[PDB]
Each structure stands twice: as structure tokens, then as C-alpha cells.
Amino acid sequence: APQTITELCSEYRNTQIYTINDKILSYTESMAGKREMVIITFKSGETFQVEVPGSQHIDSQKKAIERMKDTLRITYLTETKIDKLCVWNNKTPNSIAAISMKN
Amino acid sequence: APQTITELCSEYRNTQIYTINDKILSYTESMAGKREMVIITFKSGETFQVEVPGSQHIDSQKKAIERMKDTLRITYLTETKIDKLCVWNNKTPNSIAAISMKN
Amino acid sequence: APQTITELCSEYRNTQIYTINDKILSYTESMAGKREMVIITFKSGETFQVEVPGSQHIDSQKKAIERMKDTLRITYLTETKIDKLCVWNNKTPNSIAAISMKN
Amino acid sequence: APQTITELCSEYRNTQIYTINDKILSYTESMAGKREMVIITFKSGETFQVEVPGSQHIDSQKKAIERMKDTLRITYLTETKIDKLCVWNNKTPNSIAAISMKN
Amino acid sequence: APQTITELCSEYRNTQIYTINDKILSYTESMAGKREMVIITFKSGETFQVEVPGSQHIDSQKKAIERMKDTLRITYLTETKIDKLCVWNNKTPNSIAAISMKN
Numbered sequence: 001a002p003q004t005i006t007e008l009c010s011e012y013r014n015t016q017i018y019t020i021n022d023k024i025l026s027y028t029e030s031m032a033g034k035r036e037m038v039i040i041t042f043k044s045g046e047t048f049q050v051e052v053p054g055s056q057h058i059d060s061q062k063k064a065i066e067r068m069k070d071t072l073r074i075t076y077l078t079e080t081k082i083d084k085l086c087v088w089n090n091k092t093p094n095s096i097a098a099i100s101m102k103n
Numbered sequence: 104a105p106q107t108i109t110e111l112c113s114e115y116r117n118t119q120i121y122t123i124n125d126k127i128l129s130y131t132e133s134m135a136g137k138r139e140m141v142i143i144t145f146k147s148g149e150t151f152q153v154e155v156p157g158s159q160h161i162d163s164q165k166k167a168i169e170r171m172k173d174t175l176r177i178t179y180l181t182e183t184k185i186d187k188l189c190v191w192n193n194k195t196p197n198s199i200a201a202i203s204m205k206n
Numbered sequence: 207a208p209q210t211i212t213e214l215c216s217e218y219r220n221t222q223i224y225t226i227n228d229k230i231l232s233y234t235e236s237m238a239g240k241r242e243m244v245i246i247t248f249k250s251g252e253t254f255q256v257e258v259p260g261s262q263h264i265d266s267q268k269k270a271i272e273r274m275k276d277t278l279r280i281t282y283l284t285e286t287k288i289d290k291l292c293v294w295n296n297k298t299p300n301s302i303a304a305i306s307m308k309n
Numbered sequence: 310a311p312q313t314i315t316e317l318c319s320e321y322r323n324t325q326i327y328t329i330n331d332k333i334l335s336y337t338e339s340m341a342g343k344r345e346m347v348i349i350t351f352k353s354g355e356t357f358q359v360e361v362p363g364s365q366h367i368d369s370q371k372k373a374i375e376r377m378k379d380t381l382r383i384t385y386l387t388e389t390k391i392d393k394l395c396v397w398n399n400k401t402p403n404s405i406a407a408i409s410m411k412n
Numbered sequence: 413a414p415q416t417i418t419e420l421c422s423e424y425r426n427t428q429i430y431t432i433n434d435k436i437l438s439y440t441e442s443m444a445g446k447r448e449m450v451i452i453t454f455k456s457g458e459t460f461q462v463e464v465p466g467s468q469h470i471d472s473q474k475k476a477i478e479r480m481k482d483t484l485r486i487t488y489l490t491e492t493k494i495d496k497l498c499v500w501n502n503k504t505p506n507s508i509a510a511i512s513m514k515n
């Protein structure tokens with residue numbers, strides 16, 4: 001199994017690493033039908049989403065998507081710095097696949 | 104997908120964006136039968152609710168409703184500032200569709 | 207829908223608003239069979255419970271019950287101050303129906 | 310219903326109250342096969358456990374066990390004072406039936 | 413049941429204790445298909461993971477894996493120090509089987 005977010009990110013297609021090294025600026029959360037999602041933005045404009053579950057995802061991802069959202073909320077509320085993001089870049093805004101935080 | 108709360112809110116009928124820019128003055132949670140809901144209030148005078156789950160909600164939303172409540176709770180205890188809200192105004196008090204916190 | 211706890215509390219018989227204006231003194235949690243419940247007391251000498259799930263509750267309340275417990279735990283933990291509590295007074299100790307915080 | 314932990318404890322056999330009045334010294338968690346449990350010790354040498362879910366446990370407790378582990382985890386992290394513990398003494402280490410905290 | 417992580421660790425084949433005594437340097441989380449895992453790292457360069465739920469786990473382990481992931485996250489965010497950890501050395505990174513915290 002991978003050691004880093006970078007090797008892990010490298011196993012899928014349509015992905016790339018973003019080096020952020022900054023806390024999240026804004027957090028948006030929606031329960032609107034067909035739009036149950038989460039969106040984060042960074043000071044320099046970058047915007048990422050945690051997509052609404054759907055057919056693209058596998059059953060194992062269902063529990064993982066929920067965990068990712070819980071993660072983004074506590075991180076924002078604590079103003080915790082995000083190191084890197086592994087995002088699928090075939091979606092607008094880009095979709096979050098993995099995240100890392102460094103101390 | 105949408106990139107801001109405003110963009111998202113407009114995809115629905117009967118919604119309106121509210122610019123709070125202040126924390127939740129009041130928080131009410133209820134386990135009472137048929138009133139299993141949350142109510143929040145702002146110093147501005149405005150009150151908002153997270154509806155009792157019902158027939159008007161799609162399955163996708165069932166789980167998002169639970170998260171919104173979790174979120175409002177921590178937001179209130181943390182005294183986190185809310186940026187703006189997207190609410191259905193065909194309900195009283197107005198129903199919460201999405202939320203955004205900034206800075 | 208109600209705009210306030212007083213309002214929601216009034217929709218029930220054997221109900222009563224207690225104006226606390228104080229944080230919790232003690233928190234007791236039990237996982238002993240048939241007594242899976244939480245009890246809280248205050249400096250004023252009052253004691254309330256979040257009842258063990260039973261046939262006195264309709265299905266919609268099951269999720270809400272657990273939530274009340276999560277709310278009460280963290281509230282005690284954060285030394286958060288309670289504003290008011292709507293409770294059913296036909297139980298000993300009085301059973302929590304809803305809670306409000308403010309400030 | 311029971312108004313205090315000492316009252317509650319008294320309803321079962323093979324139980325006894327341990328007045329700790331001290332924060333938790335160590336916290337141990339195992340996700341190992343059939344050793345899915347939590348262990349806590351205090352400076353006064355006493356050690357306790359929240360048991361692996363099993364035959365002794367009725368369906369209702371099942372949810373209770375989980376919550377209990379959640380409580381100990383946060384109690385440890387915030388260094389909050391446990392007042393008393395209602396434990397089953399027919400287990401080694403003694404088994405937690407109910408916890409109590411006071412501030 | 414065991415009373416100490418070490419003792420617990422001995423009960424298993426292919427395990428081994430590592431004395432860390434330090435906080436988590438980095439935390440990585442992935443919701444990508446089949447790589448739904450958590451990876452932790454320390455300043456000494458030690459990397460450990462919480463494996464993807466697979467055929468190697470029994471049903472009771474499934475819930476404990478999720479809890480193991482919650483703990484490492486909050487533990488990281490709170491800058492809490494890990495004392496020891498029992499791991500499976502037949503995987504790369506070594507897989508966490510239990511963790512202990514002190515003081």
C-alpha cells in the first residue's frame with residue numbers, strides 16, 4: 001500500500017496534486033435535493049468539492065465520502081492547515097480524492 | 104456542479120439567499136414527536152429551522168438533514184460566523200437548504 | 207412550525223419549561239441493560255433524564271433521542287450554559303423534550 | 310427512574326461503585342479480532358475495560374457500548390474528571406457499567 | 413481480558429510493539445476507490461496505516477476500524493501524544509492493531 005499521498009494519487013487517472021499549505025477559507029454545506037454536497041475555497045481562489053454520492057463511486061466509497069466531509073468541517077472549524085490535496089480534475093469544481101495535513 | 108452558495112441556491116424555486124455575517128445567537132434542539140427539529144436565531148431577528156424529515160424530502164436528503172443539524176450544533180458551540188444561507192421561504196420559519204461559513 | 211421552544215413545548219400536555227440559565231453540574235451515562243440513559247443535575251438541585259427508548263416513543267424520535275445524548279455530553283464538556291429546557295413532568299426525574307442555549 | 314449512579318448501580322448484581330475523582334491516566338484501544346475494546350487506567354493503579362460486545366449484552370446495550378467508548382475517548386483527551394464508576398466486579402479487569410463526572 | 417497494550421499484542425501472530433512517545437507529524441486520508449484508508453507518520457520517519465476493510469477482517473472488526481480512524485484524526489488535531497502501538501509487520505506500511513496514550 002502507498003506511503004505518501006503522492007504515490008496514492010498516482011494510481012488513478014485524471015488526478016493531480018495541489019500543494020496548498022493553508023487553512024480553508026470558506027466551507028459550504030448543502031442538503032438541497034440532488035445537491036447534498038460540500039464545497040471549500042481557499043484565499044487564492046481554489047475551489048474543491050466533495051461530490052454528491054452517485055454511480056461513479058463504489059460501495060466502499062460511500063462510508064468514505066461521509067468521513068471526508070466530517071474531516072473538512074472539523075479542519076475548517078479548527079483552522080487546521082492542509083498540506084496537499086489529490087483531486088480528480090475532470091469535474092468542476094475539482095473533486096477531492098485524498099487530503100493530507102502536516103504538523 | 105456549482106461553485107458558490109449563491110449559484111446553488113438559484114437552482115431551486117422558492118429559495119432566497121440571506122447574508123447573516125454573524126454567529127448563531129440561539130440554538131434549540133428538539134426530540135419531541137413530530138417536532139424532531141432544530142431552530143436557530145440571530146441577533147438580527149431572524150429565525151430558521153431544519154425541518155422534521157418528511158415526504159417532501161428525497162432519500163438523499165435524509166442523511167444530509169442529520170449532518171446539517173450536527174453542523175449547526177458545532178457552529179453554535181464554536182461561535183463560528185455564518186456567511187450566508189440559502190433558504191426555502193415557502194415555509195415558516197424558513198427552511199435551511201445550505202449554509203456557508205467564511206474566514 | 208414553532209419559532210421557539212416555549213411555543214413547541216406548549217403543543218404538549220404534561221410539559222413544562224424550566225428556565226435554567228446555567229451549565230450542567232454532573233453528567234451520568236449508563237450502559238447497564240434497560241438503563242441505557244443519561245442523567246444530568248444542576249446546582250439548583252434539579253435532575254433530568256433522557257429516557258431509555260421504549261413504546262412511549264414513536265419511530266421518528268429514535269434518531270433524535272441519540273442526538274439529545276450527544277448534545278448533552280458535549281454541552282457538559284464545553285461548560286456550555288443551558289437557557290431553557292422543555293420537559294415532560296409526568297416522569298421522575300423529569301424527561302427532556304427539548305433544550306435551548308443562547309449566547 | 311434512578312436519580313443517581315449509586316442508585317442505578319444498586320439494581321444489578323456483581324457491581325460496585327469506585328469513587329475515582331481523578332482524570333484518566335492511560336487510554337488504550339484495540340481493533341484486533343475479538344479484542345475490540347477499550348482500556349483505561351488511573352494513577353492509583355486501578356484498570357478498567359469496556360468489554361467486547363457479546364452474549365451477555367442485550368440489543369439495547371449494543372448501541373450503549375459504542376457511546377461509552379466515545380465518552381471515554383473524549384474524557385481522556387480533554388482531561389475531565391471522572392467522579393465515580395459503577396463496574397461489574399466479576400470481570401478482570403473490572404467492567405464499566407456506568408460513568409459519572411462532576412464539575 | 414488483557415490489561416495492557418503489550419499483553420494484548422502478544423496474543424497475536426505477526427505483531428510487534430513500537431514505542432513512539434510523540435505526536436502524529438502528518439495525517440493523510442483517502443476516499444478513492446479501494447484505497448479508503450488513513451496513513452499516519454512521525455518525525456522519526458515511521459509510517460503506519462489503517463488498512464482498507466477487506467476479507468482479512470471479521471465482522472466485529474469492521475466497526476472498530478472506523479473508530480480507529482476517528483481516533484487518529486482527533487488525536488492528530490489535538491496534537492496528542494501516542495505512547496505505544498501494536499502493529500502487523502507483515503504489511504507495508506505496518507498496519508495499526510491497537511494504540512495507547514498516556515498522562
Ligand SMILES: O=[N+]([O-])c1cccc(O[C@H]2O[C@H](CO)[C@H](O)[C@H](O)[C@H]2O)c1
Nearest residue numbers: 032033034154159160161191193194198
Ligand atoms: O431540494 N429539492 O430538490 C426540492 C425540489 C422540489 C421542492 C423542494 O422544496 C420542498 O422541499 C424542501 C425540502 O426537501 C422544503 O421543505 C421546501 O419548502 C419544499 O417546498 C425542494
Ligand SMILES: O=[N+]([O-])c1cccc(O[C@H]2O[C@H](CO)[C@H](O)[C@H](O)[C@H]2O)c1
Nearest residue numbers: 134135136137257262263294296297301
Ligand atoms: O413525542 N410525542 O410526540 C409525544 C406525544 C404524546 C405524548 C408524549 O409523552 C409520552 O412520551 C414522552 C416521550 O416521548 C414522555 O415519555 C412522556 O412522559 C409520555 O407521557 C409524547
Ligand SMILES: O=[N+]([O-])c1cccc(O[C@H]2O[C@H](CO)[C@H](O)[C@H](O)[C@H]2O)c1
Nearest residue numbers: 238239240321360365366397399400404
Ligand atoms: O446489564 N444488565 O442488565 C445485566 C443483567 C444481568 C447480568 C449482567 O451482567 C453480565 O453482563 C454484563 C454486560 O451487560 C457484564 O458482562 C457482566 O460481567 C455480566 O456478568 C448485566
Ligand SMILES: O=[N+]([O-])c1cccc(O[C@H]2O[C@H](CO)[C@H](O)[C@H](O)[C@H]2O)c1
Nearest residue numbers: 341342343426463468469500502503507
Ligand atoms: O484479528 N485477528 O483475530 C487476527 C487473526 C489472525 C490473523 C490476523 O492478521 C490478519 O488480519 C489483520 C487485521 O485483522 C492484519 O491485516 C494482518 O496483517 C493479517 O495478516 C488477525
Ligand SMILES: O=[N+]([O-])c1cccc(O[C@H]2O[C@H](CO)[C@H](O)[C@H](O)[C@H]2O)c1
Nearest residue numbers: 012014056057088090091095444445446
Ligand atoms: O476512485 N476510483 O477508484 C476511481 C476509479 C475510476 C475512475 C474514477 O473517477 C471517477 O470517479 C471519481 C470518484 O470516485 C470522480 O467522480 C471522478 O470524476 C470520476 O472520473 C475513480
